[PDB]
Amino acid sequence: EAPYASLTEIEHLVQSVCKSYRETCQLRLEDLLRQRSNIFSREEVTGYQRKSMWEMWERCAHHLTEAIQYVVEFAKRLSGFMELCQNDQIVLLKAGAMEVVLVRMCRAYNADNRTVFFEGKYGGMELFRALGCSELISSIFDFSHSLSALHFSEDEIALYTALVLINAHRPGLQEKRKVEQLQYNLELAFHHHLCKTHRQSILAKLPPKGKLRSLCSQHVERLQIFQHLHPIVVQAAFPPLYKELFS
Amino acid sequence: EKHKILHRLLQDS
Numbered sequence: 001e002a003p004y005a006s007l008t009e010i011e012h013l014v015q016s017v018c019k020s021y022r023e024t025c026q027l028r029l030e031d032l033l034r035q036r037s038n039i040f041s042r043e044e045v046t047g048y049q050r051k052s053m054w055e056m057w058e059r060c061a062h063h064l065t066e067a068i069q070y071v072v073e074f075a076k077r078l079s080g081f082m083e084l085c086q087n088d089q090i091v092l093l094k095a096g097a098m099e100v101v102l103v104r105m106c107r108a109y110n111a112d113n114r115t116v117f118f119e120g121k122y123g124g125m126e127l128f129r130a131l132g133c134s135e136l137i138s139s140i141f142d143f144s145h146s147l148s149a150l151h152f153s154e155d156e157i158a159l160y161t162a163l164v165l166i167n168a169h170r171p172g173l174q175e176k177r178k179v180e181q182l183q184y185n186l187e188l189a190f191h192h193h194l195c196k197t198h199r200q201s202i203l204a205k206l207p208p209k210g211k212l213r214s215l216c217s218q219h220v221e222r223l224q225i226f227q228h229l230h231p232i233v234v235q236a237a238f239p240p241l242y243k244e245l246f247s
Numbered sequence: 248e249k250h251k252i253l254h255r256l257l258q259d260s
């Protein structure tokens with residue numbers, strides 16, 4: 001949204017992106033952290049594992065959809081995004097929404113005991129057994145654990161998720177150059193912030209190219225397998241936005 | 248493949 005952004009423009013952009021995240025982060029960090037000792041009991045975990053495949057799938061689809069709505073709001077408030085053509089807005093969100101959710105998950109992940117905040121308490125990956133995709137779940141928790149090692153600040157999460165969304169490499173963009181310019185300026189913002197805080201060492205540690213895409217592609221595959229097994233449940237219960245995004 | 252909803256969300260005021 002401007003060729004040759006000045007230092008002042010880039011400082012403003014850091015502020016703007018952090019504000020957009022602040023207004024759309026969904027879960028309050030202090031709430032999440034203060035509830036780390038609240039963990040599902042053995043009985044509660046058993047409860048979850050005894051749940052039907054369809055019920056667990058519909059719960060998880062609901063909660064993901066709620067998370068995705070906050071990412072959409074983030075995108076809408078994100079400097080430059082609404083200026084993009086309508087096609088490219090959709091291409092970026094279809095590709096990036098779930099990626100942003102996977103990144104936002106590190107805030108809700110306790111590396112100490114490998115638990116995630118879900119339905120009011122922290123639970124391990126075993127909580128999700130009824131989904132029937134344990135290896136994918138394990139991969140997702142592994143990914144969260146790799147992020148936990150960076151110990152992002154809230155401002156870092158803001159600037160990094162902006163870049164996860166504004167990725168000029170997504171196939172199907174019609175005005176690639178505009179996205180490349182937005183991406184570059186967001187990179188300048190992220191790099192500026194890291195430079196001032198002496199945190200540019202994180203750059204080398206960020207998730208490898210294609211990793212987020214892999215996790216998302218597996219999610220879609222597992223959804224297709226589920227949908228094949230329980231087609232009426234998806235029709236009757238799953239949020240339409242979720243189907244549009246992933247089916 | 249279907250993006251009617253996403254389109255509506257984006258233009259939701």
Ligand SMILES: C[C@H](CCCC(C)(C)O)[C@H]1CC[C@H]2[C@@H]3CC=C4C[C@@H](O)CC[C@]4(C)[C@H]3CC[C@]12C
Nearest residue numbers: 026027060063064067104105108117118219222
């Ligand atoms: C790991 C599990 C299972 C995923 C199943 C799959 C891959 C088949 O969709 C998912 C289901 C629900 C997800 C949470 C929904 C919402 C949020 C809030 C957001 O602020 C941060 C991420 C989080 C906690 C999601 C984490 C991943 C969860 C537990």
